[PDB]
């Protein structure tokens, strides 16, 4: 019963609680206790980006950064699993403490900064996985790589993951790598999208398959910036858009412990803004490429609000932490 | 632990559940026996409509339509309690069943039609109460009164309750009395507000007491309709507006048990719409009179979203049913 579990894990700091949880998931994979995490959910098959998703709910990136627990997380009923963000070379990310709970807000603040073991290790992990649903692989820039040359890092990762990903997610929305978010503005975006599409075309000829690419944007775009991002994704024929990542906003969590910690805010205090961004983006895209909606989804009605705003699929991170596997069941069953 | 209480209570049909709980509250309200439900909450004083509310959270109209349980409900920690709706003469409401639960959506559908015992009886209950918060008295039109002469039903009630109310709430937004929502449109509205306001100054010199009046609107108004209502409230110098009552919409609840029942929807599937109405209303009023926000509030963050859209105070009903007394403590403590 999850609230009991939650009380226990919440005695630990958020990063220690994840390390504890993932150590158990890594220990039960392929044992009669991959059943202690198994959850039967109804099938709600959905076509998106040319893929067939088991159901419309995915696990957002950032929980399994290295793809070590694909099978056990898939057993919980997700229609798809997004691993990463991963970078070309390993790096440690920002100093701990870099992750904080806002329990009364059912929100989180993270400044992880892409702590990961690099793309080559993720591929080895993916090779060993058995999951049948859709696998997202989310990639990003190494901290040291200069922002103007960001595209090189995305292109390196694509080459190593094309044979293994169901779809590739491009992360240019983390607030935790300096200047990374400038890649979603103007000619930087157009240059990045051009490089990436051309690689997709080259890699299609080498592997004889088309692997869709979705771009993951920030909820802190202005109305004009969002119109420009939408136009740029259409003109470059990007396969999808993941809306949204975490927010610099703090206006709903004033006066709450940790609200002043720098980083991206997620969970319930992001829900409304996420939904407003999806609805404005859907008007701009007008059906031309699909939206994956993420941001503070913590209930069936919240998932349904994002569908109404224009998304074809939804993802959760924070609501999984605060409501647990029951939320997967709720959403898949009634979305 | 309310989620276990709720499991049991949700074994009874909704109205039986209500009557069983209120039968219990009736036998303890205004006695030492109310230690059983008393909750200690911090003081968060807010000045609104010329009154001091001991905290920003009200019980919306509904739960106690006859004013039977003011002290008991006050002891759970509400900063204000709104009783009613009440009409001049008693009336039984519509035929049962008239109250339906949508558990997975955490919303309710109701077509009660103002089942109450009449204003004379409510005044006698109010006389016996000792609540130290603000008491609101919501008043409505008898089912038989022609909407043309609706104003007479409101003026009757005002005379009988003025000496006892903290503020008076004019319900012209229930969808359960035919024609009533027309009283918020164009010329009907201007006439009612003229009559109600004239009566208010009348009663102020008779009783030497300042009693603000607020109008409760529907969430299903068009932009042009909302602009007109707001303009009309300002021109007649109404003291505040309560946004919003229940909705005729069903977009978010398709495919759920009871989604096709006629009546007003409340709880989580009204939350987004209610907030958007408040935001748009606030834009119009430009601070010229305060908003009491209500509609699907079920968490401290949702309460704060309504504050950020412009509300000065908030009320709960459906969230009270679905999360219980602890929602009171969350909201008063962290709003
Ligand atoms: C601790 C943490 C780490 C995250 N890491 C990543 C990441 O590496 N890549 C990415 O694209 N998003 C990452 N995210 C963002 C989530 O994928 C998600 O988009 C965001 O938290 C909003 O969704 P939510 O409100 O359901 O949590 C991370 C989020 C958190 C809370
Ligand atoms: C069963 C029920 C009875 C209600 N009775 C009244 C009423 O008598 N007068 C009134 O103004 N609103 C009444 N309401 C509406 C609530 O006061 C509230 O405005 C609406 O339910 C939205 O808030 P909520 O989603 O938190 O419940 C009633 C609502 C329900 C569910
Ligand atoms: O790893 C991170 O810091 C990170 C990445 C991302 O996309 N979003 C976020 O909030 N944090
Ligand atoms: O009691 C009712 O019928 C009623 C009144 C009101 O204002 N709103 C509502 O949804 N129901």
From Swiss-Prot, chains A, B:
Catalysed reactions listed for this entry: (S)-dihydroorotate + a quinone = orotate + a quinol
Cited PROSITE patterns: DHODEHASE_1, DHODEHASE_2
Active site: 174
Membrane topology listed for this record: Peripheral membrane protein
Binding site for FMN: 61-65, 85, 138, 171, 216, 244, 267, 296, 317-318
Binding site for substrate: 65, 110-114, 171, 176, 245-246
Complex and partners: Monomer.
Protein name in the entry: Dihydroorotate dehydrogenase (quinone)
Organism expressing this protein natively: Escherichia coli (strain K12)
């Amino acid at each position: 019963y999850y609230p009991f579990v939650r009380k226990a894990l919440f005695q630990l700091d958020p990063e220690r609680a994840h390390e504890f949880t993932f150590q158990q998931l890594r220990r039960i994979t392929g044992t009669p206790f991959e059943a202690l995490v198994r959850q039967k959910v109804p099938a709600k098959p959905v076509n998106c980006m040319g893929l067939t998703f088991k159901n419309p709910l995915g696990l957002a990136a950032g929980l399994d950064k290295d793809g070590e627990c694909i099978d056990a997380l898939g057993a919980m009923g997700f229609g798809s699993i997004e691993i990463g963000t991963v970078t070309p070379r390993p790096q440690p990310g920002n100093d701990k403490p870099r992750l904080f709970r806002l329990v009364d807000a059912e929100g989180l603040i993270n400044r992880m900064g892409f702590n990961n073991l690099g793309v080559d290790n993720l591929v080895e992990n993916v090779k060993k996985a058995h999951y049948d649903g859709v696998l997202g692989i989310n990639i990003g820039k190494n901290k040291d790589t200069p922002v103007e040359q960001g595209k090189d890092d995305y292109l390196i990762c694509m080459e190593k993951i094309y044979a293994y990903a169901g779809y590739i997610a491009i992360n240019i929305s983390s607030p935790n790598t300096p200047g990374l978010r400038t890649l979603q503005y103007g000619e930087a975006l157009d240059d990045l999208l051009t490089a990436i599409k051309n690689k997709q075309n080259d890699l299609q000829a080498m592997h004889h398959k088309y692997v869709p690419i979705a771009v993951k944007i920030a909820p802190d775009l202005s109305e004009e910036e969002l119109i420009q991002v939408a136009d740029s994704l259409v003109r470059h024929n990007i396969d999808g858009v993941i809306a949204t990542n975490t927010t610099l906003d703090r206006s709903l969590v004033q006066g709450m412990k940790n609200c002043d910690q720098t980083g991206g805010l997620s969970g319930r205090p992001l829900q409304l803004k996420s939904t407003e961004i999806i609805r404005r983006l859907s008007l701009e895209l007008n059906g031309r490429l699909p939206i994956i909606g993420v941001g503070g989804i913590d209930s069936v009605i919240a998932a349904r609000e994002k569908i109404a705003a224009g998304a074809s699929l939804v993802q959760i991170y924070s609501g999984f932490i605060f409501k647990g596997p029951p939320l997967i069941k709720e959403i898949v069953t009634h979305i």
